[PDB]
């Protein structure tokens, strides 16, 4: 069975995620509205900016993260933010419509919408298949949040100084997860390895997105539609 | 009477302004919506960004401007943009409501709205009185656009290299204006000097706004709400 430290970690991560994920999606009206060249870019830029703020808020509540150096926190966030957004977005994703539904049909994004923000099927098809594969895993809340925290704490990001400590935190989390699946997830025998596979997938998605983003943000007429925060976080200026 | 060069200049400036000022204000729906800390800042940031794009489009069609060096064009724009926005905004201003009406009441901005984007009465009261004084001048279209072009071409901006040429263009415009008022504006005997006074007022408004903007943009939690273009243009990084 699980320990009270592991349990407290789970409770912390769940509370953190609840504090930074709004299931009402009521904030979305504050974004530059959707439009259907690159009509969806203002809206999706605002969406992603909002989401980065959320990921930061979540990371600050991961046990041990805000004990890391500001440099390490920044490096971990700049490397992982896009992956955590991809992960956390599964919660609004639907196997039925094969797309993300955040309230009304105004805030319902299919592949074409994201095409209208500069991206290609080389990213969007793998992204969608990742979403579907991940949704079919039917993770518990506890597992979802543990996976985000784990993704965030990978020490093999560029720019990371304290490899050993970061890897320590990450390991503690992985033990928490493996134990949780052992004791609490019936028929979850094969689950942990699948989740780890999903982290690898995220690395590939990150790679592709970073190329396409590099393409987009190199054109001033498109980058001007981005937000300051997006520009900072996805920027290369570390 | 006026000459065909002066007349062609007037025709050019009018066509330019018509091409860059949308009287329907139909683009406003694309902005982050208004809200009534600093609730109005996202909306007014988008409004101003949009407007800067417009001022740039207008300047590119001023006779002689796009023959200046990129450095001089940038310097003139960074120094004058806020003033041209203040000037061009008179077209939506109303003496009745003492505020700017751009279609529906959603896009109707009074002093309080602009207070909710970080500014104080030290700027807003002079700005409003400037708007009212300028509106009471009842300028012709031709005079309005000439005044914008003239404001844009002041060579006594910081960063300006080719003082003599810029001052030449500006002088030609001023002759165009003075003649226009002479021949075409009944009872406009005192008008030119009043308009020149309004340019001075704009300098004071610019001064105050630049201080308050410096204040705002120094706080990351507010500057993150600004747009890339706004940050560039009002930025000090020339």
């Amino acid at each position: 069975m699980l320990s009270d430290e592991q349990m407290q970690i789970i409770n912390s991560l769940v509370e953190a995620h609840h504090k930074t994920y709004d299931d009402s999606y009521s904030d979305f009206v504050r974004f530059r509205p959707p439009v259907r060249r690159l009509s969806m870019l203002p809206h999706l830029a605002d969406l992603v900016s909002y989401s980065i703020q959320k990921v930061i808020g979540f990371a600050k509540m991961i046990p041990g993260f805000r004990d890391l150096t500001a440099e390490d926190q920044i490096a971990l966030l700049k490397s992982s933010a896009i992956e955590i957004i991809m992960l956390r977005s599964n919660q609004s994703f639907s196997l039925e419509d094969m797309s993300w539904s955040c309230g009304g049909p105004d805030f319902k994004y299919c592949i074409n919408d994201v095409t209208k923000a500069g991206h290609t099927l080389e990213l969007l098809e793998p992204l969608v298949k990742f979403q579907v594969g991940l949704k079919k895993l039917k993770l518990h809340e506890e597992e979802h949040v543990l996976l985000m925290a784990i993704c965030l704490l990978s020490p093999d990001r560029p720019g990371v100084q304290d490899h050993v400590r970061i890897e320590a935190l990450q390991d503690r989390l992985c033990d928490v997860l493996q134990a949780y699946i052992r004791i609490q997830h019936p028929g979850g025998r094969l689950l942990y390895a699948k989740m780890i596979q999903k982290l690898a997938d995220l690395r590939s998605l990150n790679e592709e997105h970073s190329k396409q983003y590099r393409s987009l943000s190199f054109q001033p007429e498109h980058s001007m539609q981005l937000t300051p925060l997006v520009l900072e976080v996805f920027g290369s200026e570390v | 009477m006026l000459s065909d060069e002066q007349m062609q200049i007037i025709n050019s400036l009018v066509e330019a302004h018509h091409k860059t000022y949308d009287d329907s204000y139909s683009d406003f729906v694309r902005f982050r919506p208004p809200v009534r800390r600093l609730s109005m800042l996202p909306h007014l940031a988008d409004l101003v960004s949009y407007s800067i794009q417009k001022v740039i489009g207008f300047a590119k069609m001023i006779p002689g401007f796009r023959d200046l060096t990129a450095e001089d064009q940038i310097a003139l724009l960074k120094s004058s943009a806020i003033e041209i926005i203040m000037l061009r905004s008179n077209q939506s201003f109303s003496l009745e409501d003492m505020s700017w009406s751009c279609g529906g009441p959603d896009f109707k901005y009074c002093i309080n709205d602009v207070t909710k984007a970080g500014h104080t009465l030290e700027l807003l009261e002079p700005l409003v009185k400037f708007q009212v004084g300028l509106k009471k001048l009842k300028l012709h279209e031709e005079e309005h656009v000439l005044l914008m072009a003239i404001c844009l071409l002041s060579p006594d901006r910081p960063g300006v290299q080719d003082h003599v040429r810029i001052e030449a263009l500006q002088d030609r415009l001023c002759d165009v204006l003075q003649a226009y008022i002479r021949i075409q504006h009944p009872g406009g005997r005192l008008l030119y000097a009043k308009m020149i006074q309004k340019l001075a007022d704009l300098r004071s408004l610019n001064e105050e706004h630049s201080k308050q903007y410096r204040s705002l943009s120094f706080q990351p939690e507010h500057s993150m709400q600004l747009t890339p273009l706004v940050l560039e243009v009002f930025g000090s990084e020339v």
């Binding site: 930061i56 600050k60 920044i74 925060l229 976080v233 | -």
Partner: peptide
Amino acid sequence: RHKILHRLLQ
């Protein structure tokens, strides 16, 4: 620089 990031990390 990372002004906004620093800020948001309190």
